[PDB]
Each structure stands twice: as structure tokens, then as C-alpha cells.
Amino acid sequence: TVPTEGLEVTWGNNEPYKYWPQMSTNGTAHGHPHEIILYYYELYPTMTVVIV
Amino acid sequence: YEHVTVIPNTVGVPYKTLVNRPGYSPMVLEMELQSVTLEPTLSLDYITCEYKTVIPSPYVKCCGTAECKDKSLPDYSCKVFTGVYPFMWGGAYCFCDAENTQLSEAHVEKSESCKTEFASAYRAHTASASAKLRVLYQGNNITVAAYANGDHAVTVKDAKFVVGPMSSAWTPFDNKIVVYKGDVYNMDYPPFGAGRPGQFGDIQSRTPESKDVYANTQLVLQRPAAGTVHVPYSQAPSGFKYWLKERGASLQHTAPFGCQIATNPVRAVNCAVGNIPISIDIPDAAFTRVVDAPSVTDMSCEVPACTHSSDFGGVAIIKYTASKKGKCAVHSMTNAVTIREADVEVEGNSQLQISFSTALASAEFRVQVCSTQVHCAAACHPPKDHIVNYPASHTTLGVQDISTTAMSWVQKITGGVGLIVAVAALILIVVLCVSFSRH
Amino acid sequence: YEHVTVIPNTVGVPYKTLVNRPGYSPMVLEMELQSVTLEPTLSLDYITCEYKTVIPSPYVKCCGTAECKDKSLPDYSCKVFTGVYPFMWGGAYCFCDAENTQLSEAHVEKSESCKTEFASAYRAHTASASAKLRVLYQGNNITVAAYANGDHAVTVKDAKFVVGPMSSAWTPFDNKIVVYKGDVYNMDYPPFGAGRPGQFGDIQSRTPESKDVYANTQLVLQRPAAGTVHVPYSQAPSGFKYWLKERGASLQHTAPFGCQIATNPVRAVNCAVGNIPISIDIPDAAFTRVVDAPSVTDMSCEVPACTHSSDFGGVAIIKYTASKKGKCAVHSMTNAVTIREADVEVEGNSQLQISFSTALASAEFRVQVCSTQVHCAAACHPPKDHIVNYPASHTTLGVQDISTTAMSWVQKITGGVGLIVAVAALILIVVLCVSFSRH
Ligand SMILES: *[C@@H]1O[C@H](CO)[C@@H](O)[C@H](O)[C@H]1NC(C)=O
Ligand SMILES: *[C@@H]1O[C@H](CO)[C@@H](O)[C@H](O)[C@H]1NC(C)=O
Ligand SMILES: *[C@@H]1O[C@H](CO)[C@@H](O)[C@H](O)[C@H]1NC(C)=O
Ligand SMILES: *[C@@H]1O[C@H](CO)[C@@H](O)[C@H](O)[C@H]1NC(C)=O
Ligand SMILES: *[C@@H]1O[C@H](CO)[C@@H](O)[C@H](O)[C@H]1NC(C)=O
């Protein structure tokens, strides 16, 4: 798993690698109400449920 | 003119600041951080290495009794055995068949190889810090180097810089550390003069050139076998060899915040904690008067594309009419949008192009070009790549940043409910007033 | 066998402690502290010394115009003057009577004498501690030397000693100090690159052997007088010289707690704060069984004189009956009285003499000699001298210490008044019951 702050991996005697996550989603921020909710849920799962 | 700014402790991300002085044109500076180093103060306690055992030849005395005296050498031992009858290759050694004795002795010294293979114990104290920067100044790159505290000042091309102090005192080293050929470990080594028979610290010395050695290994002499001449003994094996085979992972692979470790001298580099304030003093001859700079009178904005990825995913076109040929600065008036370009050249009646990056779903911002402002707006799409190899170049979002369509729906629901409360309350007020008056 | 004690941090006064182990005779030890040293950790910042000015020969060009170019040397200046007409011992210099010019220049360097007369600035950090002891052991004096923390142990005559850690962290040094030939001062020196024209720090360098020099003196050239050839100038005087004449008193004369100070290396000696714990390990071979020590069967105490002065002003005579010849230890069973002698010799039927010191006005204490107890009491007189040249060798007294005569008067007065309340109280109770029952 890749956390927000990033991951570092070392293999043998080689140099380490670095990875960072990037935003993606299957919803849309414009259009019908039920598609608006999905957009924010997939980015900030915990705050969306509390606020709603 | 004195200017003060604050920069976060992140390597590889450029930042910009605006300088504004009445009566003169505005100026924009760009800064980028390349390295930060911490270095503690160290003190030596003792060193350890392997040992050697010395056994001189036995003394065999037949038809008699022998004895031995005490000596001051480390781990000295003597013993006397009776009833021996040794043999050699040509026959028995001595004529007497009884009343013989044997004497044996041994002691412990320091190995010769300690000058090359050794480990050292240190005690650590407060560390210092240093930093190096790149600054874009009047169209040229210049470099500065200074200590990260307020007690140093440098001058490059008649500009004075002062950096520090840091906001945090976090360090990855504890009070006691151990160093061996490029590795640093955190370990609570035993006190001097209080060693153990089979662990780290059985042999101790103060310097590789010293003559005093402390030893706490076990040494017991045993009875020789029948018909043989030899000196058997029992002893605990060396503790330095054992440590090498089970020492575990080093500090480089376990430290937090992504710090790197080096040992000659001991250092820690590129720890991302805190932030660093910076102060700069700019001379008067570097400024240009408002009457000499060109003026721009008419503007419009259009945005053909936007994708809110971690890179520069935007493009913008601005139209302008200028009074004369010259140079101009570009600076953004909002915090959630960053613009790469620092300056442009303006002439006649034409257009200019810029690029930007942002995390907003719906983008609205202002752009300032030589003391005038223009309004831009557009809609943005999400990306498709899940993982990349470089950090983001924009800041995070707050609770107030919400798409315009989402805000519209909140307003209708909240307003509609509130009206029903408003109308119901008016009925109640009227009924009480009537009942009061009727009575 | 472990034993733990605590001694206060006072130099030149002996202390005693008692070791009691079942099955063996008691043993008494004596200890005295000779020196305590603190030493900080230092890092160097910069140095200062005098400066020198270099002026080459002037250039006189008649019927022409001169000009000069810029250089990078510190505090460089050049000027051009018009209308000159020099004279020499043989007559006028140049044929022209007009349009003459003169060129002048000067710059600043570092003096050669800086290798012998200079001052240095330092940063201070946490200090270490060390100590030296004298111990009376088995009838002989031995000495030990060790670091004042729990990380060091020494062995003298088969005994282990551990000293420390200390109970206070007070140090007389601040963060910034300046050192000059045996004197140490506390001073907030200006930062590197930020000197002043006439105070401490006009000239700065990183080490006595460096080639980089920073200077912030004022240097202005002036017009030459008519008919002469010379190069006049105006410059602020040296700031290092002024400091030597106005520096004031050093730390050795102003520091609190009576500390002494030495500078090679920088140390503080004999500051009286806190107390020091001590741990000692005694082998079994040093003890004697109770069956071999002599016994004492009858005791008495008589005291001919007592004056409660700062020195040993008491004398006592004790009678005894002993079973056989041998040694015995003596010890006090109260805190207000201290006894000088540690060991005595006993034989047959005889008497021994001892001396003591105390601050009590009325004395009562117990003395133990080889597992027996005796009771002594006396009245003491005050001294006649106002001032002495040494500290007291006894402890202070408390509120409960009062002479026997004074205590008796307090008891009689309080008892008498209490009776009056007690008698009056009983009459009230009797009357109250009669009223209750009769109604
Ligand atoms: C979105 O839909 C695609 C359809 O192929 C699916 O693979 C993916 O797991 C879904 N979720 C995200 C976050 O992409
Ligand atoms: C190289 O050898 C010298 C002595 O011969 C020793 O002091 C030093 O530690 C050695 N260095 C390495 C990397 O083994
Ligand atoms: C040097 O300045 C140029 C602009 O003239 C810039 O493009 C370049 O990135 C600078 N050098 C570095 C190492 O950033
Ligand atoms: C003695 O002179 C040398 C240089 O000749 C100097 O380094 C040293 O500090 C001087 N010592 C004293 C006590 O003056
Ligand atoms: C040394 O020991 C003797 C007893 O043998 C004692 O009288 C003397 O006071 C000791 N030394 C010092 C400096 O007290």
C-alpha cells in the first residue's frame, strides 16, 4: 500500500525507489446529485460520512 | 529596503515572493532549497577489539614438589597437579615413577589487529545546522551558503542575506551511539570497568595506543590427560565476533522522516521538518520608476483546457494593448493557483501565454500584470494515472473550496426549510397577541 | 556487600559512616573531599586584532587628466584632484603652470602581530564533572580519582567505588564567552559580517592563519595642502585598543558561590552546591568475627569541661573492664555531637580519653564502644572570641533544642493555666444537668 506521505523500497544492492499517490475517481463534480456525492467520498471517505 | 519571508522545509520545490515599494514597479523573486545538514558534537569513551591468550611451556619436576608465586598480570592463574608420568618419543621422561608434579600458567593480552578492526563508543550533544540556496536575481542565477542561525551574514552582488533559526529541535540521535565503518547504531553500552563475560564490552581500552587493558573473561585450568604433555583450559568465546553476526539493521534503513546518514564526519541530511525564515536587504539602484515602465490598458482572459494533475496542467491566453516596448512581471493573487512564468515582454497589440497548476474542481483567480488585474474562470477534469514518482507542486484544499454546482444545491435546501419555520412563527405571534387583547 | 551514603559538597571537612553486618564486629570509615572540577565544551567562532593601512607613492601628471579603475581589495578608494603645483628642494617640479593633476589611493590589510596578541570568541555547551577523594581504610590512607557519574568504577585494594551523579546542574558560564590570556568575560559579541566602525569587532577573521579579512572602518581622502606632496586621510581609530583600557573586572572576582577559574583549559574549581552520593563494595576478607573481638562489661562517664566553640572544645573520661587486648571502634549515637577518634586500644582495667564538638547549650548523648552503651551529660559555657578563620565542624540546631532549666519554666506555666480552665469547666457541667432534669 502507498500512504499519503509516500513509500520507499529497496531491492538488493540497487538504489531505492519512491512512489506518491495521485487523485483519480469514477464520479463527476458536475451533474446529478448522486454522482456529486460519489466524487468526494472516494477522496475523503471519513469526513464525508460525518458531515452528511 | 528590508523584506522578510517564510519558506517551508521541502527540497526541490520553487517558491515566489512579491516585493512592493511605493513609487516603484513591483519585483518578484524566486528561491529554491538544495540541501540541509545537521552535525552533532561528539566525545569518545572507549574502544573494543579481539583478544589473544598466552601460554608458556609447562614445567615438569620429578621426585619433588613445585610451587608458584603471584603476579600482577591480567587474568593470571597457576595450579599444581600430582601423580604425572609423561612420555616422549624415545621413552619415559624421568626415572622416578612417583612423586612428580606439573606447573602451568596463562594470562590474557590485547591482539595486534586492534589497529585496523575496532569499534568506538561516543556520547552525543546538541547539533548545529547549515543550508545552501539558489536565488533568481535580475535574470541571473546566484548561490549562497550560510549557517542556519541568526549569527551569520553573507553578501553577494551587494545584497545581504540572513537565514535561520529553525523552527524545530528534532534530532535522530540519542545520547549514546556506536560507530563502525559507516554504520551508526543506538545502543546502551555497559559502564567502563563493569564488563560481562560473553557480551559487548568484555575487553576495554581508552585509546588504540594505550597500554592499560581490562579483561573479564573466565579462565580455568584443568587436569592433563594421561601420557601427554599439554596445557588444557576452558574459556568463554569472544563477544566482539558474536556482535558482528547478529547486529541487525542500521540507522539508515530505520530512521523516520526520510533522513540519510553519513559517518565521516557523522551527519544527517534532508530531514523534512519545520520551516525556515529568510531576510533580504535590496539596494536602491535595483528599482525602476513607475513613469519609465510601460503601461497596459485593456485585457481579456480565456482558458481552453484544465486538468488538475500534480504537474502543470493548465494553459491561458490574455490579450493586451501596451503603450511602449518594455518588460513586465506576472503574479497570482490567490493561494490555490501557482504560475510558472516570472516575467514577459510586451509590445504593441498582441497576446501572451502562461501555464498554471491547481487542485480545485472549479477555478477562479486573478492575474496582475504591471499594476492591472484581470478575471479568469474555467472548469477542470480529473486525471487517469494512479501513481507517479514526484511530489505535488500545489497546496492542499480547505472546507470552503467546493464546486459551484454543489454550492447551489446547498442553498436551495437550506433556504426552503428555513421559510417553513419563518411562516409558522408568524402565526404563533398573532394568536398570543389576540388572546392577550381579548382578556 | 553494598553500602550507600551521601555526603554534602564541602571541601576540607571529614565525615564518618557506620557499617553493621550481623555475625561480625562493626567497622567505621572516614572520608574527606579534596577537589571538584567542571569543564565545558567549546567551539570557536572568530578572532580580532589590529589593522594596518598601506599607502603607495602619489602620481603627479602635469598638463594632463588622470583616471583610475576599481579593484576588489577591502576598503579601496581613489580620488582625483585638480589645480596642484608641487615644490621640491631644488625648485618646481613640472614646467606647466596649470592643468596639473594628482592621483591617490589606499586600502586596508591585516597586521602581522596578530599571531601573538589576539582575543577569541566561543560558544558554550553542557559541562562534565570530576572529583578526588581521600579514604581511611584498614588503618591506612588511600586515594581515588573518578568521573562524577554512574559510568565509571575504580578498584583500589580490592574495593570498588562509584561516584555520582551530582544533584545540581548550576554552571557559572553563559552561552557566549570571550577569552584573553587568563581572563574570561561574558559578552554578547556582534554577528559575523555585522561589525561597527568604533567598537569591539571592527575587524574579523575565522582563524589566525586565514587570508580572508572583513573590515568596516571609515576611510575618506582629503585635499592636499599647497606646495607639498603628501597623502592625507581620515579614519576611525582602532576598537581593539579601546576595549583593553575599559574591560573591567573578570569572572574570578565577581562569580557567586566562591568559584575559582582557570583558562588552559577553561575550568571552574570548588563551587559549593548540592551533594554527592557514593557507593562502596567491601570484600568478606576484611571482617572479623564477633567471637574474637574483646568484650566490655562495665562503663562510666565523667566530663570535666565544655565550651561550645567552633573547634573541638570537649573532653571526656570513660572507665571500662575488658576481657583481653584488642581493637575497638567508637561512634556517636546522636547527630548534634561529633567525635574525632575512630579507633582505641583496650587492655585489662583502665580508662581512655576522648574529645568532641557540639553547639548545644546542654549536652546529652550516647557512646558505643564494641557493642555497649554509656550515658553522659553536662552543661557548657560560651566562648569569648568574635571571629575565626575556618568553618564550623558541627551541624546546626533546631527549635526543639532547649536547655533543661528553660524547659522546666515552660512546663510549670502552661500546667498552671490549664488547671484553671479544667476546674471551671466541671462546675458548668454540674449546673447544666440539674436544670435539664428538674424541669
Ligand atoms: C472505476 O471504474 C473502473 C472500470 O474499469 C475500475 O477498474 C476502477 O476500479 C474503478 N475505480 C477507480 C477508483 O478507478
Ligand atoms: C585503513 O587502515 C588504517 C590502519 O592501517 C586504519 O586506521 C583505518 O581504519 C583503515 N580504514 C579502513 C576503511 O579499513
Ligand atoms: C539558471 O537560470 C535559467 C534562466 O536564465 C533557468 O532556466 C535555470 O533553471 C537556472 N539554473 C538552474 C540550475 O535552475
Ligand atoms: C607565546 O607566543 C606564541 C607565538 O610566538 C603564541 O602562540 C602564544 O599564545 C604565546 N603565549 C603567551 C603566554 O604569551
Ligand atoms: C594518614 O594516616 C595516618 C594514620 O596512619 C593519619 O594520622 C593521617 O592523618 C593520615 N593523613 C591525613 C592527611 O590525614
PDB file of N, CA and C in Angstrom, chain C residues 68 84 107 120 221 233 236 248 267 325 375 384 406 414 424:
ATOM      1  N   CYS C  68      41.367  56.545 -12.798  1.00  0.00           N
ATOM      2  CA  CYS C  68      41.684  55.336 -12.048  1.00  0.00           C
ATOM      3  C   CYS C  68      40.538  54.340 -12.155  1.00  0.00           C
ATOM      4  N   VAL C  84      46.996  71.493  -8.837  1.00  0.00           N
ATOM      5  CA  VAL C  84      48.138  71.329  -7.946  1.00  0.00           C
ATOM      6  C   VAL C  84      49.385  71.937  -8.579  1.00  0.00           C
ATOM      7  N   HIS C 107      44.312  51.259   0.808  1.00  0.00           N
ATOM      8  CA  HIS C 107      43.481  50.127   1.205  1.00  0.00           C
ATOM      9  C   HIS C 107      43.986  49.564   2.531  1.00  0.00           C
ATOM     10  N   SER C 120      39.610  35.755  21.388  1.00  0.00           N
ATOM     11  CA  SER C 120      38.836  34.714  20.728  1.00  0.00           C
ATOM     12  C   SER C 120      37.454  34.590  21.353  1.00  0.00           C
ATOM     13  N   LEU C 221      39.468  60.298   1.819  1.00  0.00           N
ATOM     14  CA  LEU C 221      40.652  61.031   1.397  1.00  0.00           C
ATOM     15  C   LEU C 221      40.374  62.529   1.364  1.00  0.00           C
ATOM     16  N   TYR C 233      44.463  61.665   5.024  1.00  0.00           N
ATOM     17  CA  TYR C 233      43.251  60.856   5.091  1.00  0.00           C
ATOM     18  C   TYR C 233      42.637  60.981   6.479  1.00  0.00           C
ATOM     19  N   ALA C 236      38.613  56.224  11.386  1.00  0.00           N
ATOM     20  CA  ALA C 236      38.252  55.962  12.769  1.00  0.00           C
ATOM     21  C   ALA C 236      39.345  55.147  13.460  1.00  0.00           C
ATOM     22  N   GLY C 248      37.099  46.184  32.459  1.00  0.00           N
ATOM     23  CA  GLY C 248      36.532  45.917  33.766  1.00  0.00           C
ATOM     24  C   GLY C 248      37.002  44.612  34.387  1.00  0.00           C
ATOM     25  N   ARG C 267      38.149  26.037  33.083  1.00  0.00           N
ATOM     26  CA  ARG C 267      37.618  25.200  34.149  1.00  0.00           C
ATOM     27  C   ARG C 267      37.072  26.076  35.267  1.00  0.00           C
ATOM     28  N   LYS C 325      43.195  -8.124  75.199  1.00  0.00           N
ATOM     29  CA  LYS C 325      43.710  -6.991  74.441  1.00  0.00           C
ATOM     30  C   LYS C 325      43.255  -7.053  72.987  1.00  0.00           C
ATOM     31  N   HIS C 375      25.991   6.604  79.004  1.00  0.00           N
ATOM     32  CA  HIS C 375      25.232   7.849  79.006  1.00  0.00           C
ATOM     33  C   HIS C 375      26.042   8.959  79.672  1.00  0.00           C
ATOM     34  N   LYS C 384      34.624  33.413  73.900  1.00  0.00           N
ATOM     35  CA  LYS C 384      34.904  34.833  74.062  1.00  0.00           C
ATOM     36  C   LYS C 384      35.427  35.528  72.811  1.00  0.00           C
ATOM     37  N   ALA C 406      15.356  26.026  81.069  1.00  0.00           N
ATOM     38  CA  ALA C 406      14.311  26.754  80.356  1.00  0.00           C
ATOM     39  C   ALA C 406      13.063  25.901  80.171  1.00  0.00           C
ATOM     40  N   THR C 414       2.467  26.570  81.712  1.00  0.00           N
ATOM     41  CA  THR C 414       1.375  26.013  80.922  1.00  0.00           C
ATOM     42  C   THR C 414       0.484  25.113  81.768  1.00  0.00           C
ATOM     43  N   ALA C 424     -12.872  25.160  86.226  1.00  0.00           N
ATOM     44  CA  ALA C 424     -14.045  25.946  85.862  1.00  0.00           C
ATOM     45  C   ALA C 424     -14.999  25.165  84.970  1.00  0.00           C
TER      46      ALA C 424
END
